Amino acid sequence: AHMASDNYFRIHVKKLPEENKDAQGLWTWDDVEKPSENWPNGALSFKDAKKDDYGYYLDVKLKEQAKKISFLINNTAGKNLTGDKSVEKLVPKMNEAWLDQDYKVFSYEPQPAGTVRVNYYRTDGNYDKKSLWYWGDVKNPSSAQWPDGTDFTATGKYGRYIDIPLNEAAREFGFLLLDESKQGDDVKIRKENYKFTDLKNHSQIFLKDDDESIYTNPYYVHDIRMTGAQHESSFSTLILKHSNITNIDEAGKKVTTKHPYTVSYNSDQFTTKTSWRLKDETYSYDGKLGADLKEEGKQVDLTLWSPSADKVSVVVYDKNDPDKVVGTVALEKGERGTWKQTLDSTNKLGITDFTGYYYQYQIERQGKTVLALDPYAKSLAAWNSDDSKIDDAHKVAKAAFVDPAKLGPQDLTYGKIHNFKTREDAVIYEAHVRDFTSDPAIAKDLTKPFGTFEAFIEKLDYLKDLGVTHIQLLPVLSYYFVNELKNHERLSDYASSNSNYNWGYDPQNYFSLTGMYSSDPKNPEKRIAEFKNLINEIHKRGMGAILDVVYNHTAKVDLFEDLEPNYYHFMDADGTPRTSFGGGRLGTTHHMTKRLLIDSIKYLVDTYKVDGFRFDMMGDHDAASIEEAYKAARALNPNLIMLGEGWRTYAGDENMPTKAADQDWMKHTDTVAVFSDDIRNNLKSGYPNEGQPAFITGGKRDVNTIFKNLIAQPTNFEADSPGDVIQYIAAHDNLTLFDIIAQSIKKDPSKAENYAEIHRRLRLGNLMVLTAQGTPFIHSGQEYGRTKQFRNPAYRTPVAEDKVPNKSHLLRDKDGNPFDYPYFIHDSYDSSDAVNKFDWTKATDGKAYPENVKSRDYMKGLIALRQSTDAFRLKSLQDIKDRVHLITVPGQNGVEKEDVVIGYQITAPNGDIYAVFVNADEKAREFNLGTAFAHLRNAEVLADENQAGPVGIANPKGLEWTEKGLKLNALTATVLRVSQN
Template sequence: MATKLTKALIDKINQINLHFESSIDGWDLDNLDIKLTDEEGSFYQIRNIKTYKRDKERLTIVTARLDLEKNYKIIFAGTETPVYFGAVVRTDEFDNIFAYDGQLGALYSPQATNFKLWAPTASKVELIVFKNNQEEAPQLGTFTMNREENGVYSCLLNGNQNGLSYQYRVTFRDGTVNYTGDPYAKAVVVNGKRSVVLNPDEVKLKNFKRMTKFTNPVDAIIYELHTRDLSIAADSGIKNKGKFLGLIEEGTLNSKGKPTGLDYIKSLGVSHIQILPIFDYGSVDESKPDVPQFNWGYDPENYDSPEGSYSTDANNPQTRIIEMKQMIDGLHKQGLRVIMDVVYNHVFNAAKHAFHLTVPGYFFRYTRTGQLSDGTGCGSDTASERAMMRKYMIDSLTYWAENFKLDGFRFDLMGIHDIETMNEIRAAIDEIDPSIIILGEGWDLNTALAEDKKAIQKNAVEMPRIAHFNDSIRDTAKGSVFFDDEPGFINGASRQEKLLLKNIMGGQDLDSKTYNFSGPDQVVQYLEAHDNYTLYDKLLLTNPDDDAETRRLRHLLGTSIPLLSQGIPFFHAGQEFMRTKDGVENSYKSPDSINEFDWNRPYEYAENVDFFRSLIKLRKSEPLFRLTTFDQINKHIHALQTKKKLIAYELEDDKVSYIVVLNASEKENKLEDTELKDYQVILSSHGKQDNSRILPPISVTIMKKEK
């Protein structure tokens, strides 16, 4: 029995895992001399010992329920080994003991600031303050924080601490010392490694208010853009290129005198601007504003502070906050609502993130073998089902909604999160404004969470008023995003008509193994988003021999489908003018030359843009194109034809009837067995058109009859 005990970890509230230097196979467990004692010298009965066939260097001792506020040690072979926190931090018992429902962060008042950090597994926490808020400022002082209930450490600094830069030094029982920013920081230094005390009154905007409550999610038309993309091009005519303020400049023109930026977007008629991540992220160096850098921003660093590279002065912690508010306020004044893209499912670097540095092992999911779960494909999955991660998400989202007057939240990889958390988020947001839209990617990803708990499309019915991106309409219409040259309805595939019509009618009766929507307000209808190929680039792959006009018509047909579908239509900015990224499938870190708007293209493809505007105008004016329940849809919409690459359906009430015909054939197509008397063609992708049964090749035709 010469082997050495190397570590002892509490993995359950009554179990300690012992790890040895070499195999313990063949030991006489009945006579094994192992003792468990605490810091006061009390000994604890070991009730059982477990060994493992596949791990012969480990055993587990079972004892009475442990007091996690105490320090323990194992005595084995005359040597004492300290017991540290292990997987117990990921148990319900840990949450029951330490979960905290109070405020955290730097709680400011002009008289004093109370710093509060949740770090229940730490043995000591110190507050370090710095001389100024520059990235490399020297230390000004260190203060030992007091441990309070639920593992919260606090320190009160008297006086007005507005603008004070700080971080925490967190010491653990095993001697590990971590330096970390405040996970609840509302302001940060350049590149976000240190936190800054914020006086909320100094970043308030005069008359900055919420917009009036929105009507219904199906009335929204969402336009997704990236802050830098929109304005960075030399020909944008925008002064604040790549900045928050660039989104709200009025009167900007390209070199040919045509509107760009805000004026152009407003002219489209969309209702909501969805902006790719604008919280502080780690993949751009904010200290080098003159060096061209691009990233989508799905690399969270500080969740509650805006990204500094979009500010005109990243070195001033307040500027980014004020300018982001000015952007939102400016968009609101133009009648445009703002959806924030949020990424709570993973972090930029788990090992260096404040979540791990303050409570190691708690905020992330782990596999049975102790490795970080990686369903996101980004190196980590956060554990939304744990009390303090859930609290964090709710606290963060309500902070953004209340202080930045946001109108919606788009959840990146929402399927990583759990149903209960998403429903609690919905409830918390409802207290601020129930018309705030919540939508997300409900993909079923391989994370360490049971399927029946995941916030995925299959479980959508358990998450009322939370919408999901509908990949069925996307792939049926244009072909799978996973197979570059696979076509869909618009680009040559056969027998897609019936499935596409199901999607057009709100995603009803789709494969129940994947989809289970409760109504059209849960269905985001789209063909293109920031990731994967743009629709134009996809068409180059699926139909390389098309001439330019055929490709234009296919694109117009595809872009029309979300606006003619029941649910929430969604568009990638520039989709209406056939945006291309030169064949780059995922341009998350591609240069500006790939990602920037080509501001000549909206006018080169003005025919497509004008038709897009006309469809938006029709959808806004006619409730039949945006019904609110499946019962209404089934009452008012009827299939007329779904064969031979043609889909035709009628929308009607007691006053009016519309016939919508989508012809994906490269030849003229015939609408059969439908009486067209008294119908007038009100919109056609081919310009003027009679109400003939003969439909032009690759076309969208909408007819109307007053009753």
């Protein structure tokens, strides 16, 4: 059937990870015909899986020469149930694999424990008197009269076979292949014993004819074999005799003219590829790159780096119908592997003004042609990935000839940001352009199309009122999996997968803006004007703009492989691009990839006059690239700030370690800050253990650990500067603060009392964050209690396993009972506007939602408070150790080592004394002041259980002053200030 086919692959499954097969699917990537898309339900469902004696199997179409098939089993939920799996196709006809009940992968059907199957294949097909004589770690060794061994009678897939019962923990056995039609010694097919050493790992072995080797796969490939060559050979495991070449590091499994060589070990032959490093020696190019539109549109200077190309032409498409090809113009060689051309009045395209015309690069290598996107494109044709299968032209976007300087508000320059002098002074607010205005409640209010750069301007006053200094925007650079032609359609049904909505972490280009937030994606110029406008309006309200940027990976390997093969990405030994979600991992240590990142940073700073960047998965990069970027950015805007995700994720090029730009980098630089998961996890929980009780959610924590985090000394990386630390409890990733608090305390928000309690804890957390040292970061909607509850009317109670929303948690109360509408989305990257909308009514309408608006005013107060004195934003570790002192010290005045209370004092530079007291407990708690802190009784109260700000509260609520000190009501924090003035 498909087993009589060159390009099908059968994956067999011992047991499905979960109970219901209707809710599970086989997700595939790498060398398959159609890699699975639309997580999770685009997976091949087990609903229709056929079944053999072993279990379920599924067949997958291939795309020859297919070598690597990757797969996993997911669910509707859609968790990655098995974890990622991978099979290498050993020979062309290896068309089957098996997953065991431990999700290990075999090239043969695994046999039950306590059994080794012995497979013997004979080219001559004569098994008549063929038998096996065996001994060792087996139950019943050959005991009869020699040479009466066990007959080979059963015929299988790989010759005849014998099943041998094993002992427990079997490790070694020995055997002889016999031909009992012979006499004396000639009954031994090979005279010398066979010994198999590896019964712990294999339940089948494979023998043929009189071959001495004991094979571990049915394709008779040896254990030691070559896998790559450069220019040092990749091996499977670990010579002079068998190696050849024309035209010994075993722990790393490795063995060690300007044109390709040919290397072979026995039977496996490899064409050599150039190291990226060699490429860099000869082609490292530092001149201008891209399409620069000059002479008022009448000329274009093109430069593309493509060293390995034979020919390069620009294909020019019509400004009014991008499908129409106008013509082609050959590029000529330039310096250092570039290709160049000047398009001017001399063109044979019938073009006078090039502005708004579109283009791709037709690249010819070894007689094969591809269409590639200029990595330096400044805008793009309207993009729809749903049309990517139409032809080569639709596989990647078309670039546009544009001139950004001329577009948008001409007065545009860097922000002059209120209450901001250094990185400790910033208050970062993280918003998605679409979320911020997609709430249908404001539809009649908006004058611009919703969810766009320009609609965003209409709600900037809310943010100015809030007091934030820096608006961090989720990716506005072009991303792939999106239909921009549908950007004005409202995504009003609840859904958490298969949506046109995208957060933007699928990068297509690093210079062009996405058309998704444009009023007109078909106009390549409008998005530039619109964005420059948004940025200008942000500045004119005394704020800055920070751009989430995603250099760590692209959406598709082809985007950069088709420009120049085996260079731009991080790669394995063989030179295979390292990948992430089907795209390439960009190798920022490679000269031209490094300059891609830096040129981009420089270009977006100069063009859009932005005030900083947030690096997605920054730990994926080398530290040097990021520091270089910081320098280059600052040379243009000396007030610019950077931050990133410094998780410890560096992979890099195989066998090449580099200092990564992660949390550990902080002890060596005072430039780019990192997110502090230590504070996040300690106060409320975090990935991957969401909902674990923690400091503001009923879970006592180590009091010193809390204090350290509050002075910007997280306990999991060294911060020698408080500006190194981005302090946060919520972000676009994971559950919202409101949602995680409800999850953690197991209280359903649909009981009004629970709603009240969650908001108390929410204010608490926000207080702790906004009075902490370092740089506070606020997830958009964190101020009002934003929710991502899944409120589809059919989802009021738990649903069938095959209807569970993608990336949801089912929240339960104390009795284990589902909340009302128990599903909450914790990863909303592919969720609709119903999930993702910023709720404007909850944020602003005090009569309809007193509690939500009370929390919003609380935030606004905390930001004013923070801005009123430098006490909370001290500029050095040393000063922080001078000025900040723990009042509730573990082991004194009966202060427990772990608790849900804390108190401390700051002596500000101007001599004012500030104190922060937090009672996250469910009863009144007393803070012992002693003699040392008696002066706090003189304080004005700046924050209580109802409100916050820099002006003293006349009638403070939730406080009682006692003999010992100060007693806070349950779920109460206070900020105190004493001014000896």
